Design a protein around this ligand. Sequence first.
Ligand SMILES: O=C(Nc1ccnc(NC(=O)C2CC2)c1)c1c(Cl)cccc1Cl
Length: 288
Amino acid sequence: TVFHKRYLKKIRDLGEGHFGKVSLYCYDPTNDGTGEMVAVKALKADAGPQHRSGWKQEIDILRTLYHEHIIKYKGCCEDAGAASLQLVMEYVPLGSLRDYLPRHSIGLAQLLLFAQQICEGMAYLHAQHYIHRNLAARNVLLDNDRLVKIGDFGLAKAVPEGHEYYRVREDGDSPVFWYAPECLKEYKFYYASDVWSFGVTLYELLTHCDSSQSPPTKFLELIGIAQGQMTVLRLTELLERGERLPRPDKCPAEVYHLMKNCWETEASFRPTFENLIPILKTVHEKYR
Ligand SMILES: O=C(Nc1ccnc(NC(=O)C2CC2)c1)c1c(Cl)cccc1Cl
């Protein structure tokens, strides 16, 4: 599928992804303003060959994914400037849970439904042999009060069939506060590492993405802000000691224990996304 840049009318900027900026455009070939609203992700023109090969990998990944809880790929646009492809995706109207939750008080049952849907989309992703590596409330988009979709595949990687993990690089942009200890210490990302990040995302939802309760805020309160190059080492050490993010206010005790089970230090003790689906369905039913 191909979109022409001459019909793309920029409305506003939506934010910054991993490889570049996301903008909202009206794709209007008739010029009558009745065209579809689309989210367009672009690679910064100044980016090097490392970001360029990774950007092409992200497009390749999103083009192959098709799920009700995964942002819909619409096509690509020939960017004459930057000499690359612009990723055309569906506009998800309510935006990210990070932006939405602080301004709209959502009930516990609805948050658990969002958690269930995240697990459904993540179970499909893992079945396709991919790891997400950036599962956070910031990357979860809300279509309506009852539908959520996973976004930003900028860190997503293919896991070979014979392998259970992918070896990661020492990176400044890594979302360390959403990462399992095996990622921080051994630079290995397992399917089970995405489950750890889900536990963190669930914590975020239960706090209504309150910035004063965010994973960086809480972990840095424990680590301190004057630790030289040792923030990650101190994070690794507290996690190994069994320290964890606290129970969000009004989060049921059993839901917090499910969260802590996503945060097992031993990756094999964590549930898979497939195990989480029937559990979250039952928990959502109890609270609805
Ligand atoms: O792709 C993103 N956001 C989208 C996509 C589609 N539609 C929307 N919709 C809106 O932003 C609505 C609120 C105006 C946002 C996005 C950005 Cl910009 C930064 C980090 C992570 C992610 Cl996933």
